[PDB]
Design a protein around this ligand. Sequence first.
Ligand SMILES: Cc1cc2nc3c(=O)[nH]c(=O)nc-3n(C[C@H](O)[C@H](O)[C@H](O)COP(=O)(O)OP(=O)(O)OC[C@H]3O[C@@H](n4cnc5c(N)ncnc54)[C@H](O)[C@@H]3O)c2cc1C
Ligand SMILES: Cc1cc2nc3c(=O)[nH]c(=O)nc-3n(C[C@H](O)[C@H](O)[C@H](O)COP(=O)(O)OP(=O)(O)OC[C@H]3O[C@@H](n4cnc5c(N)ncnc54)[C@H](O)[C@@H]3O)c2cc1C
Ligand SMILES: NC(=O)c1ccc[n+]([C@@H]2O[C@H](COP(=O)([O-])OP(=O)(O)OC[C@H]3O[C@@H](n4cnc5c(N)ncnc54)[C@H](OP(=O)(O)O)[C@@H]3O)[C@@H](O)[C@H]2O)c1
Ligand SMILES: NC(=O)c1ccc[n+]([C@@H]2O[C@H](COP(=O)([O-])OP(=O)(O)OC[C@H]3O[C@@H](n4cnc5c(N)ncnc54)[C@H](OP(=O)(O)O)[C@@H]3O)[C@@H](O)[C@H]2O)c1
Lengths: 445, 445
Amino acid sequence: ATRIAILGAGPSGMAQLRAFQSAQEKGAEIPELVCFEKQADWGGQWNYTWRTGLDENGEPVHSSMYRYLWSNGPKECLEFADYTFDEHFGKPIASYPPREVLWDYIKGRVEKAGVRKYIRFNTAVRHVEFNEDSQTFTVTVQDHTTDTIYSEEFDYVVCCTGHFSTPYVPEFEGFEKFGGRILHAHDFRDALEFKDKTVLLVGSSYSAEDIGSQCYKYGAKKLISCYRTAPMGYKWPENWDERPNLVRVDTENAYFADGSSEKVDAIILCTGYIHHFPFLNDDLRLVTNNRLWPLNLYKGVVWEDNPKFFYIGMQDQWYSFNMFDAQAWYARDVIMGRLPLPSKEEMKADSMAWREKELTLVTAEEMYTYQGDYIQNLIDMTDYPSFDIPATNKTFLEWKHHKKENIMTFRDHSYRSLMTGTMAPKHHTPWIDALDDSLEAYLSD
Amino acid sequence: TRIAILGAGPSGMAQLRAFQSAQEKGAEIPELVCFEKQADWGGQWNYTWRTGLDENGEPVHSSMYRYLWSNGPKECLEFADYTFDEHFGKPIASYPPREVLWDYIKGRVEKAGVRKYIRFNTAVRHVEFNEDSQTFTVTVQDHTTDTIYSEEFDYVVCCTGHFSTPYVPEFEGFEKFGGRILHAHDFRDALEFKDKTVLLVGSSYSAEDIGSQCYKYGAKKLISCYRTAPMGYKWPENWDERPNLVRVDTENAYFADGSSEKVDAIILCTGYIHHFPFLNDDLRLVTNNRLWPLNLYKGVVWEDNPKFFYIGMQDQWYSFNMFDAQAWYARDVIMGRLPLPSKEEMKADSMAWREKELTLVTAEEMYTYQGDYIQNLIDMTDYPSFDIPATNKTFLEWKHHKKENIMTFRDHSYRSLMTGTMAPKHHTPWIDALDDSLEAYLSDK
Ligand SMILES: Cc1cc2nc3c(=O)[nH]c(=O)nc-3n(C[C@H](O)[C@H](O)[C@H](O)COP(=O)(O)OP(=O)(O)OC[C@H]3O[C@@H](n4cnc5c(N)ncnc54)[C@H](O)[C@@H]3O)c2cc1C
Ligand SMILES: Cc1cc2nc3c(=O)[nH]c(=O)nc-3n(C[C@H](O)[C@H](O)[C@H](O)COP(=O)(O)OP(=O)(O)OC[C@H]3O[C@@H](n4cnc5c(N)ncnc54)[C@H](O)[C@@H]3O)c2cc1C
Ligand SMILES: NC(=O)c1ccc[n+]([C@@H]2O[C@H](COP(=O)([O-])OP(=O)(O)OC[C@H]3O[C@@H](n4cnc5c(N)ncnc54)[C@H](OP(=O)(O)O)[C@@H]3O)[C@@H](O)[C@H]2O)c1
Ligand SMILES: NC(=O)c1ccc[n+]([C@@H]2O[C@H](COP(=O)([O-])OP(=O)(O)OC[C@H]3O[C@@H](n4cnc5c(N)ncnc54)[C@H](OP(=O)(O)O)[C@@H]3O)[C@@H](O)[C@H]2O)c1
């Protein structure tokens, strides 16, 4: 009788299916589930592809992940509370696993849940309309396996389409004339492409940090990072420097705000992403910048203009997978009727409260502690196994510290699991010398 | 009555110009809105450094690159109603670079004053036909304001082109290759491939020219590979033609003849697909690239809904003249000047054209076919007639010049079939004509 459409089979869409399956396992009647995915497989960002721009169906390439990518936070900060690393890998592993390993892990859970059967792959979501007459959603999709466009009626929609895929790509003067590659971090795939090259990186967040680190590791001659407002702050290697922003570009040269000048071979724009939902009209569409707390989302999940429509993972992330889990579990309970929603007036007030609080945050520590607090709120309302949130916050602190000490070796460190207490062993190869990013290599000796 | 024109490239311009011409001659024309997602008109001919997704996250439309020149004789694409001699005021050479032909196209439409009809930076999201109102609801995203809105229209003309959404096949090992893999659509600047071995995958105009550009601008070596037939042209010393790619490894490309070689980058010159993410199956054209797509009465009228039209969806020998021929016809049908047959009669007519299409073997037969097709469209409207049989003759001359020497075909000259003016020789052999600019082309040096 009740039908839910879940948009995307990324970590969040997986979490949503996991949430319902978990309720069903406990004897509960769950609604009919349909999950639309445009890729051929699950994993979202984590499913790797050599492709760039548009995929073989003409849909924008989703994954922004690149070769040699490893986890950027401690894995212990993203461990599933109901599916441990210990359960999955059958043994202790190091704290910063390669993409393939974390992909194997998140798949591992949904494999055990039997939820693949709900996903229509190779299917891109085209449009979502709310019908006021029947109080249902018409979800229109393109099945690229059959080359068919069809639609179905749903009672609730859960958007898990992510927000690190549609690039924010600013222009700089001279770009039409520059003789080198100008790509966005989203199209970055292989560091080897930039070996012995001089690479300009425009940005001062994780993509700048890590893509630079990848180019360094795989042998770029020189790296130049430029910042908009403030530098990354770390002590970079001898051939890597940070400067004020790019101002213009020659056929061969880049010109910066400090009056500085350099000959660059390639420009990689690590300038972030936008919240882009081409399948939604303004009545349903979330419009926001990347932040810990976007507005119009009750408990960070419920669309305030239409509370039958939900968003997962739309916040900026310190916490990732177990946030999505907490979000999806909450969305489940609302959908199912276990948690009734307040007035539209009372929802907005709760959101503004969280917003006002977000505005006071200065330090990294305050910020992921704020997110930790948000998740604590969510899990308390739910079956989801409460886990050690304060102890996670101390793991993040140790990680921040490890980065400040040496940015090129923070991945060499190890952390205690906050689910099992399993002390993660030191990896068989220091990050810098571990050229192989395969799962097989990582789990071997 | 209101008409939605989707796209402001040559076809969208031709359609606006058609409506402007009838209005100049006394007739009352319908109200007109044209939607363009780019900031300026031109379609393919509007160059951009951007690739993949534009600043709004819309897929980058233009597949055009630095140093691109008309690939056929300009005389084969002259407007019947706005000659080169009118626009330029002096005789020029036969293969103008992009900027020069982009200037020409704008010239006609600036003069017509049809810019007032176009809403730029606006992406077409959806078009639905409503039975009860017999109108079209065009949903649209206005990126200047970040607003999604919808307007009702009586007729819709689709001019979104079909050489933008790449066909991108995968080959075994692509995931491991250390060099670049891009489709022709992403190719921007040949200088990126200076001192490099580039593999061009494919057999048509893209492989020919993208290859020619890399040769011109200093690639170490070039390798073409064909799926069914070699291009059969006499290539330079450092240019290799081989049967199809089978496999790739980290550094090396492998071919069906058992030949292997180290390649630095792979350019997939494998063509394009007809993609309309903004239409449902009731209006959506599905076809491979060819002279006679089915479902289009007179190659133009959508047969299941005759209030919807497609301009320029055919494969192209003729280009701009046909878009006029098609634009005039569609205008005359909208304005009621040309009555439509019953669907059965339309589909019988379309079947005839398809039957004849399948008999075509040689290049001559094919552009002569299109020639005949354009003649049929001209005859029904007030569009100035022109010397098709002689255009076909020029196409023939162009074919010989390519066959004789594929590297020098651009240095030949042809006679205007609109004015009789013989094009002069250009001041620089193509090979040495490194400067892109309109300025450099129109001056003497
Ligand atoms: C380069 C990169 C590295 C990262 N590294 C880390 C890390 O090390 N640690 C960490 O904790 N987090 C990392 N992240 C953060 C990341 O956002 C989360 O880990 C998580 O992957 C987000 O989950 P999601 O399911 O909400 O979105 P996504 O992972 O982006 O999944 C969204 C899914 O929806 C699908 N989709 C989108 N649109 C449509 C549509 N129209 N129709 C059908 N399907 C659609 C996509 O194909 C995709 O499968 C990284 C992100 C990026 C971009
Ligand atoms: C690389 C390349 C080189 C070429 N060289 C030549 C040549 O030398 N000589 C020749 O005669 N022909 C050439 N062509 C053929 C080309 O198809 C035509 O010259 C011409 O561009 C066709 O015009 P069009 O308006 O039909 O399509 P396009 O030029 O492709 O224009 C389509 C327009 O629609 C817009 N659009 C698409 N989708 C949307 C949407 N959803 N919302 C809003 N706007 C949208 C686009 O932004 C674009 O402006 C070339 C084509 C390519 C790809
Ligand atoms: N696992 C990994 O190794 C890894 C690798 C890549 C990405 N990621 C993930 O990807 C997500 C987002 O990372 P991100 O860095 O791409 O996004 P982001 O954190 O939002 O970073 C955006 C960056 O772009 C800069 N910027 C924006 N406009 C600019 C302009 N006009 N000129 C100069 N700089 C400009 C911003 O500078 P200001 O701050 O000054 O505004 C900021 O530094 C994170 O969750 C991260 O974990 C992880
Ligand atoms: N102005 C210029 O200098 C210029 C430059 C580039 C493009 N263009 C224009 O762009 C338009 C399209 O030209 P295009 O060449 O890009 O497209 P196209 O004419 O459709 O040709 C596509 C090519 O890709 C090949 N192909 C498809 N799948 C393949 C596979 N799996 N393996 C190997 N090859 C495969 C096809 O080979 P098969 O023979 O097997 O089918 C065909 O040769 C034309 O109008 C052209 O004029 C112009």
